[PDB]
Design a protein around this ligand. Sequence first.
Ligand SMILES: *C(=O)[C@H]([C@@H](C)O)[C@H]1C[C@@H](SCC/N=C/N)C(C(=O)O)=N1
Length: 267
Amino acid sequence: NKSDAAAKQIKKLEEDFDGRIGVFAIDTGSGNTFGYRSDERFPLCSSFKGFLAAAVLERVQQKKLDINQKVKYESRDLEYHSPITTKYKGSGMTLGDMASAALQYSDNGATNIIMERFLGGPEGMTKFMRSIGDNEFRLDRWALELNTAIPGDKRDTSTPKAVANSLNKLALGNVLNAKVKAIYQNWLKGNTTGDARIRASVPADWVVGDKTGSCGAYGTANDYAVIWPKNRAPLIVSIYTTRKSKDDKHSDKTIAEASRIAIQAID
Ligand SMILES: *C(=O)[C@H]([C@@H](C)O)[C@H]1C[C@@H](SCC/N=C/N)C(C(=O)O)=N1
């Protein structure tokens, strides 16, 4: 009942914003879930940057990479939206600081430097997700270029369910050991780009780690989060949206509200 009604409200909400809404939410304590269009495909936009940071952490843990190892890139033509990498181009950055920048500011230069040098490009990123049991995720193109969000293009997409399940595994599961897991979780908590999304949907005394995506086209934006309520078990929330026309703008309020609705469903 609480699930069917929840679904009606998501459906009216996508009708109000003239697009498509995908939701998957998990209560990790009760194992309750709620899903709407959770197995439909949606562009990742920047959101894969959250999974990229975890990939780096897995390498670190197998001692293939040092978190403090220096990354130099002073001759690189930096991608658009490299707010962090741009400032430090002259000195370079630690891998840790680069990886966290890719997540916490969605830095394109950080994302792409990491993917060229450490992770084996998009396909290596895809391989990483496969290796944790995620069979929907696919990364086809590099950061920035992948944000075309052309309707019916399956490149650089996943599903809300798969995103939630992957996030669950990485943020709360046993893919990462206790140490590098805790670094991952802190990274997520310190995200700077999602105050108007899942974060706006929860009491302020709840702790959230999230990663957003905003393609800048077809009104395509997303957010995914781990939520540590007070006096309650962690939640996972995964919110993916598209709109009909190229010049449709994304809707933060729609994500926020879908998040409220989703959380009600699993309460
Ligand atoms: C990924 O989705 C984006 C693309 C340019 O690679 C980046 C850009 C930011 S948009 C910041 C929100 N709006 C600001 N005015 C972004 C993100 O929001 O996650 N990732």
